[PDB]
CSV table of C-alpha atoms in Angstrom, one decimal:
chain,number,residue,atom,x,y,z
A,1379,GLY,CA,101.3,-112.5,-125.9
A,1380,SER,CA,103.1,-113.9,-123.0
A,1381,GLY,CA,102.8,-115.1,-119.5
A,1382,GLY,CA,101.5,-118.5,-118.3
A,1383,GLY,CA,101.9,-121.5,-120.4
A,1384,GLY,CA,101.8,-125.2,-120.3
A,1385,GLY,CA,100.4,-127.1,-123.0
A,1386,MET,CA,100.7,-129.8,-125.8
A,1387,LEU,CA,100.3,-128.8,-129.3
A,1388,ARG,CA,99.2,-131.7,-131.6
A,1389,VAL,CA,98.8,-131.1,-135.4
A,1390,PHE,CA,98.1,-134.0,-137.9
A,1391,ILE,CA,98.3,-133.6,-141.6
A,1392,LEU,CA,96.9,-136.8,-142.6
A,1393,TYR,CA,99.5,-136.8,-145.9
A,1394,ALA,CA,99.6,-133.9,-148.3
A,1395,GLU,CA,100.6,-133.0,-151.9
A,1396,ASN,CA,103.0,-130.9,-154.0
A,1397,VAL,CA,106.0,-132.3,-151.8
A,1398,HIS,CA,108.5,-133.2,-154.6
A,1399,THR,CA,108.3,-132.6,-158.3
A,1400,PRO,CA,110.9,-135.3,-159.3
A,1401,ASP,CA,110.6,-139.1,-159.0
A,1402,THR,CA,114.2,-139.5,-158.4
A,1403,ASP,CA,115.5,-136.2,-156.8
A,1404,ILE,CA,113.5,-133.9,-154.6
A,1405,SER,CA,112.0,-130.6,-154.1
A,1406,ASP,CA,112.1,-127.7,-151.5
A,1407,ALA,CA,108.5,-128.7,-150.1
A,1408,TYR,CA,109.6,-131.4,-147.5
A,1409,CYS,CA,106.9,-132.2,-145.2
A,1410,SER,CA,107.5,-130.3,-142.1
A,1411,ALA,CA,105.5,-127.8,-140.1
A,1412,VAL,CA,106.3,-124.7,-137.6
A,1413,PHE,CA,104.1,-123.1,-135.1
A,1414,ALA,CA,106.1,-119.9,-133.7
A,1415,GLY,CA,109.4,-120.6,-135.6
A,1416,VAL,CA,109.9,-124.2,-134.2
A,1417,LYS,CA,110.1,-126.1,-137.7
A,1418,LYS,CA,110.1,-129.8,-137.0
A,1419,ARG,CA,109.3,-133.3,-138.6
A,1420,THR,CA,109.2,-137.0,-137.8
A,1421,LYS,CA,112.4,-139.2,-138.6
A,1422,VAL,CA,110.2,-142.0,-139.9
A,1423,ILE,CA,113.1,-144.6,-139.8
A,1424,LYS,CA,111.1,-147.3,-139.5
A,1425,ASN,CA,109.3,-149.3,-142.5
A,1426,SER,CA,107.0,-147.1,-144.5
A,1427,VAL,CA,104.0,-149.1,-143.9
A,1428,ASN,CA,102.1,-145.3,-143.5
A,1429,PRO,CA,101.3,-143.4,-146.7
A,1430,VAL,CA,101.8,-140.2,-144.4
A,1431,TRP,CA,105.1,-138.3,-144.7
A,1432,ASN,CA,104.2,-136.0,-142.1
A,1433,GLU,CA,103.0,-138.4,-139.3
A,1434,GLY,CA,102.1,-135.5,-137.2
A,1435,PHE,CA,103.7,-132.3,-135.7
A,1436,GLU,CA,103.9,-131.6,-131.8
A,1437,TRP,CA,105.3,-128.7,-130.3
A,1438,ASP,CA,105.1,-128.0,-126.5
A,1439,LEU,CA,103.5,-124.8,-125.0
A,1440,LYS,CA,105.6,-124.8,-121.9
A,1441,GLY,CA,106.9,-121.4,-122.2
A,1442,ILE,CA,105.1,-120.4,-125.1
A,1443,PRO,CA,101.1,-119.4,-124.5
A,1444,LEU,CA,99.0,-120.8,-127.2
A,1445,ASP,CA,97.7,-117.2,-128.6
A,1446,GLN,CA,94.9,-116.0,-130.6
A,1447,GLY,CA,97.1,-114.3,-133.1
A,1448,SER,CA,99.2,-117.3,-133.3
A,1449,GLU,CA,99.4,-119.3,-136.4
A,1450,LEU,CA,100.4,-122.6,-137.9
A,1451,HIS,CA,102.4,-122.8,-141.0
A,1452,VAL,CA,102.7,-126.0,-143.0
A,1453,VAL,CA,105.4,-126.9,-145.9
A,1454,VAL,CA,104.3,-123.4,-147.7
A,1455,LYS,CA,107.5,-121.7,-147.1
A,1456,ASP,CA,110.6,-122.2,-145.0
A,1457,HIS,CA,109.1,-120.8,-141.8
A,1458,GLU,CA,106.5,-117.9,-140.6
A,1459,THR,CA,105.8,-116.9,-137.2
A,1460,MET,CA,103.6,-113.9,-137.7
A,1461,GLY,CA,101.4,-113.5,-140.8
A,1462,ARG,CA,99.3,-110.4,-140.6
A,1463,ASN,CA,99.6,-110.0,-144.2
A,1464,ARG,CA,96.6,-111.1,-146.2
A,1465,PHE,CA,97.7,-114.3,-147.9
A,1466,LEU,CA,96.0,-115.5,-151.0
A,1467,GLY,CA,95.2,-119.0,-149.6
A,1468,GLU,CA,98.3,-120.5,-148.3
A,1469,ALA,CA,98.3,-123.3,-145.4
A,1470,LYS,CA,98.2,-120.9,-142.5
A,1471,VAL,CA,95.9,-122.2,-139.9
A,1472,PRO,CA,94.2,-119.7,-137.2
A,1473,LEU,CA,95.1,-121.1,-133.9
A,1474,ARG,CA,92.5,-118.8,-132.3
A,1475,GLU,CA,89.8,-121.4,-133.2
A,1476,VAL,CA,91.2,-124.1,-130.8
A,1477,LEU,CA,90.9,-121.6,-128.1
A,1478,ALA,CA,87.5,-120.3,-129.4
A,1479,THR,CA,86.2,-123.8,-128.8
A,1480,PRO,CA,85.8,-125.6,-125.4
A,1481,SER,CA,86.9,-128.9,-127.5
A,1482,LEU,CA,90.4,-127.5,-127.7
A,1483,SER,CA,90.6,-129.4,-131.0
A,1484,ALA,CA,89.7,-128.4,-134.7
A,1485,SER,CA,90.1,-129.7,-138.2
A,1486,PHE,CA,91.0,-127.5,-141.1
A,1487,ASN,CA,91.3,-127.9,-144.8
A,1488,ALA,CA,94.3,-126.6,-146.5
A,1489,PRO,CA,95.7,-128.2,-149.6
A,1490,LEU,CA,98.5,-127.0,-151.3
A,1491,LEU,CA,97.1,-125.4,-154.3
A,1492,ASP,CA,99.4,-124.1,-157.0
A,1493,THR,CA,97.8,-120.9,-157.5
A,1494,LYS,CA,94.1,-121.6,-158.9
A,1495,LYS,CA,94.0,-125.1,-158.1
A,1496,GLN,CA,91.2,-124.6,-155.4
A,1497,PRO,CA,89.8,-128.0,-154.3
A,1498,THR,CA,87.4,-129.7,-156.3
A,1499,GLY,CA,87.5,-133.2,-154.4
A,1500,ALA,CA,91.1,-133.5,-153.0
A,1501,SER,CA,92.0,-131.5,-149.7
A,1502,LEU,CA,94.3,-131.8,-147.0
A,1503,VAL,CA,93.0,-131.9,-143.8
A,1504,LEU,CA,95.1,-130.8,-141.1
A,1505,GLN,CA,94.3,-131.0,-137.4
A,1506,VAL,CA,95.1,-128.7,-134.6
A,1507,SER,CA,94.6,-129.6,-130.9
A,1508,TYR,CA,95.8,-127.4,-127.9
A,1509,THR,CA,96.1,-130.0,-124.6
A,1510,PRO,CA,96.6,-127.7,-121.6
A,1511,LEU,CA,99.2,-129.4,-119.6
A,1512,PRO,CA,98.2,-128.4,-116.1
A,1513,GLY,CA,94.7,-127.6,-117.3
A,1514,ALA,CA,94.9,-123.7,-117.4
A,1515,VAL,CA,92.3,-121.5,-118.8
A,1516,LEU,CA,94.6,-119.2,-121.1
């Protein structure tokens, strides 16, 4: 919905896979995440002492209220604001869970399986946390 807001969205991918197919060239699966249409990433201009290509993605819920029907999309496709359509198992995080818990923070496991590459030990762990700026009970 829409109305009041004021929040800081925090997402930590902790380093995913299936980002690039070639070793020299690249692939269209760049480490980037998108909440409601805003796909952003980190510049990581400093030395790569970090194995994480994602670093983490933050959004502001200043004018956009963190909803029950809002979804987090990571790498899968260019971007997706509204799901609704039953996905097979793509990395589409249900933000409702963060609001459901008084912790306002949750972890999820969403690895990039080609199709039938279901997790058998390796899984991507993305965390979602909704930090209210004014401390509103949305």
